[PDB]
């Protein structure tokens, strides 16, 4: 409520986290920056992504933010440690809050958990390592790269999404009880992913989906003793490396 906060993402996907933040009404001043000139990060190499993350700090320096949310799971997996080393404010990414959500919500440490993410996020084993450190023993991972461009084309239903889901999911050995939506974009197809598993494995109830935005809202509420529903008319500024009007038009859609 007092704190001026930053939200960093590679592009418009971070609006899924911003939506979660706004719904909770916990912050009163939010500065969003999407690196839309250079998105996606997920298909790129660690060196490049780490440098992207440091350059994001340069963007926020003049804004005098008191906390930075790295809404991007890819930048969280690859760049967050380096950004924190070179940062006088707290930087909170979206991986660790989801590990806490799993701890709270998934007491069966042998439940089959499936981590979905970009190629860079999955190849970093960020989630697998943190989950193993907390005793989870039945952890699978799957890079679902094409979900990102599909979702940015607003293809959230239909034959093409069903065939893409089939393409990525048919090779899975284990049926998951928990799916980690380890990418900003994947909340927009959360019901379709749930519907995919109910349809094809005769489930009555879908696996549990972990939403990165909801988990970080929960963590920040606890960590900063934030009253929910306290900030009903926040100030939100949008910034981008690409065209800002384009990014603002997409914000209108993602935050609806």
- Does 231 qualify as catalytic in the annotation? no
For 215, half-sphere exposure in the C-beta direction (CA atoms, 13 angstrom radius) is 27
- Distance of alpha carbon 35 from alpha carbon 249, whole angstroms: 15
Select from 108-116, 176-184, 191-199, 238-246 the region that touches a second copy (CB under 8 A): 238-246
166 binds, among ligand DGL, a second copy, none (CB under 5 to 8 A by kind): a second copy
205: Cβ contacts below 8 Å, ≥ 6 apart: 198
- Does 72 qualify as catalytic in the annotation? yes
Which one among 67, 106, 111, 164 touches a second copy, defined by CB under 8 A? 164
81: Cβ contacts below 8 Å, ≥ 6 apart: none
Which one among 99, 150, 179, 189 touches a second copy, defined by CB under 8 A? 150
Q: In what order do the strands lie in the sheet with 29-34?
A: 91-93, 67-70, 4-9, 29-34, 235-240
Which one among 184, 188, 215, 231 touches ligand DGL, defined by CB under 6 A? 184
Which one among 121, 144, 241, 250 touches ligand DGL, defined by CB under 6 A? 121
Q: Is 229 annotated as a binding residue?
A: no
Q: Which residue has the tokens 């930075």?
A: 68
89: which 2 tokens?
């404010």
Q: Is 9 annotated as a binding residue?
A: yes
For 144, half-sphere exposure in the C-beta direction (CA atoms, 13 angstrom radius) is 32
73 binds, among ligand DGL, a second copy, none (CB under 5 to 8 A by kind): ligand DGL
Q: Does residue 230 interact with a second copy by CB under 8 A?
A: no
Which one among 88, 107, 133, 153 touches a second copy, defined by CB under 8 A? 153
- Distance of alpha carbon 239 from alpha carbon 191, whole angstroms: 30
- Distance of alpha carbon 26 from alpha carbon 3, whole angstroms: 10
21: Cβ contacts below 8 Å, ≥ 6 apart: 7, 27, 30, 69, 213, 217
36 binds, among ligand DGL, a second copy, none (CB under 5 to 8 A by kind): a second copy
Q: Does residue 172 interact with a second copy by CB under 8 A?
A: no
Q: Does residue 215 interact with ligand DGL by CB under 6 A?
A: no
Provide the binding-site residues for ligand DGL, judged by CB under 6 A: 9-11, 13, 39-42, 72-74, 118, 121, 148, 183-185
Q: Name the residues annotated as catalytic.
A: 72, 183
Which residues fall in the annotated binding site for substrate?
9-10, 41-42, 73-74, 184-185
């Amino acid at each position: 409520s007092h704190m001026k906060i930053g939200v960093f993402d590679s592009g418009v996907g971070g609006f899924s986290v911003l939506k979660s933040l706004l719904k909770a009404q916990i912050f009163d001043k939010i500065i969003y920056y999407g690196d839309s000139a250079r998105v996606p990060y997920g298909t790129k190499d660690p060196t490049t992504i780490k440098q992207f993350g440091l350059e994001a700090l340069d963007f926020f320096k003049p804004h005098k933010i008191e906390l930075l949310i790295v809404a991007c799971n890819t930048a969280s997996a690859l760049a967050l440690e380096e950004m924190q080393k070179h940062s006088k404010i707290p930087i909170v990414g979206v991986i660790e809050p989801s590990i806490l959500a799993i701890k709270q919500q998934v007491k069966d440490k042998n439940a089959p958990i499936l981590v979905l993410g970009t190629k860079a996020t999955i190849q970093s084993n960020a989630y697998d390592n943190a989950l193993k450190q907390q005793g989870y023993l039945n952890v699978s991972h799957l890079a679902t790269s094409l979900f990102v461009p599909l979702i940015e084309e607003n293809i959230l239903e239909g034959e093409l999404l069903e065939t893409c889901m089939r393409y990525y999911f048919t090779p899975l050995e284990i049926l998951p009880e928990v799916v980690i939506l380890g990418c900003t974009h994947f909340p927009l197809i959360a019901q379709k992913i749930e519907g995919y598993f109910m349809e094809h494995f005769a489930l009555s109830t879908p696996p549990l989906l972990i939403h990165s935005g909801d988990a970080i809202v929960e963590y920040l509420q606890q960590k900063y003793t934030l009253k929910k529903n306290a900030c009903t008319f926040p100030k939100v500024e949008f910034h981008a490396s690409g065209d800002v009007v384009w990014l603002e038009k997409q914000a209108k859609e993602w935050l609806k």
